[PDB]
Design a protein around this ligand. Structure first.
Ligand SMILES: *[C@@H]1O[C@H](CO)[C@@H](O)[C@H](O)[C@H]1NC(C)=O
Ligand SMILES: COC(=O)[C@H](CS)NC(C)=O
Ligand SMILES: [Ca+2]
Ligand SMILES: [Ca+2]
Ligand SMILES: [Cu+]
Length: 277
């Protein structure tokens, strides 16, 4: 049931942080946000779920139409380790000779913001807003680094799929996965969400800004205009040493037509969509 959703309860939470770790990203100021009750996908959208959508609609993703997408060099641009690879896309995540046949339950990758909106709308859903996403990530805890608390490895256990070792030379796979993990891997957070931090980055519906006010808001949607859309949660590539973005308060951005080997999504909805019998 990798398309199942969980009810996210109505509430008020502190979005952002007054102790930002990447100040340039507008993690600050902390602000009180009220969110109405809604539903969030328990899992990142998987390759199998995305294939159902493509089978139904014939949808060609933007990476397939452009002919290329960004791949991390270690698995074969914003950084030397990001390469535009011809023929890399959701069915071929590291280029034309790679395949998804052995990883049907891993998160779909190389999906743009437009691809994600197409999928979620086809499913009777939508992308979450940044505030909905962050509220859900926090899993009912207040002002914590991670969905589960402040310790990276609570009780000596790995709680998310990120990088271990010296990036980018060595990824030890200590957490069990060098690349992606199945969408149902690792513990759920307090709302029942899996891999909300780590694994694949996750698109949200908001336009990106770094300028936020301390005023209290209700179901905020982000700025009315922009050039980049917000992504959240970090990925299997993140490490404290260079990309400390597997925190709920963290945030990044990309143009809506862009795609990469560490970027996926999950859907949300005001109410349960029609039962998929
Ligand atoms: C998509 O269609 C192909 C061809 O009919 C089929 O083999 C495959 O199992 C389908 N995928 C899903 C997820 O239903
Ligand atoms: C995310 O990619 C990796 O961890 C790869 C897998 S072969 N290893 C290196 C050293 O980059
Ligand atoms: Ca890992
Ligand atoms: Ca994720
Ligand atoms: Cu990161």
């Amino acid at each position: 049931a990798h398309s199942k959703m969980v009810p996210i309860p109505a509430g008020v939470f502190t979005m952002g942080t007054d102790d930002p770790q990447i100040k340039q990203d507008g993690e600050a100021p902390a602000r009180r946000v009220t969110i109405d009750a809604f539903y969030m996908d328990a899992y990142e959208v998987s390759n199998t779920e995305f294939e159902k959508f493509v089978n139904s609609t014939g949808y060609l993703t933007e990476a397939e139409k452009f002919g290329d997408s960004f791949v991390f060099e270690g698995m074969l641009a914003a950084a030397p380790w990001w390469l535009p690879v011809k023929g890399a896309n959701w069915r071929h995540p590291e280029g034309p000779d790679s395949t998804i046949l052995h990883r049907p339950d891993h998160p779909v990758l190389h999906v743009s913001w437009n691809d994600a909106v197409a999928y979620c709308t086809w499913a009777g859903k939508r992308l979450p807003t940044e505030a909905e996403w962050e509220y859900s990530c926090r899993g009912g805890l207040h002002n914590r680094l991670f969905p589960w608390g402040n310790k990276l490895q609570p009780k000596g256990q790995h709680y998310a799929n990120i990088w271990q070792g010296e990036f980018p030379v060595t990824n030890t796979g200590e957490d069990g996965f060098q690349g992606t993990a199945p969408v149902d891997a690792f513990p759920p957070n307090g709302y029942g969400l899996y891999n909300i931090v780590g694994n694949a980055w996750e698109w949200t519906s908001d336009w990106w800004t770094v300028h936020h006010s301390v005023e209290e808001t209700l179901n905020p949607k982000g700025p009315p205009s922009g050039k980049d859309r917000v992504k959240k949660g970090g990925s299997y590539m993140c490490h404290r040493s260079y990309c400390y973005r597997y925190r709920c308060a963290a945030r990044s951005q990309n143009t809506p037509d862009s795609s990469a080997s560490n970027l996926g999504f999950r859907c949300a909805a005001d109410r349960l969509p029609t039962m998929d019998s």
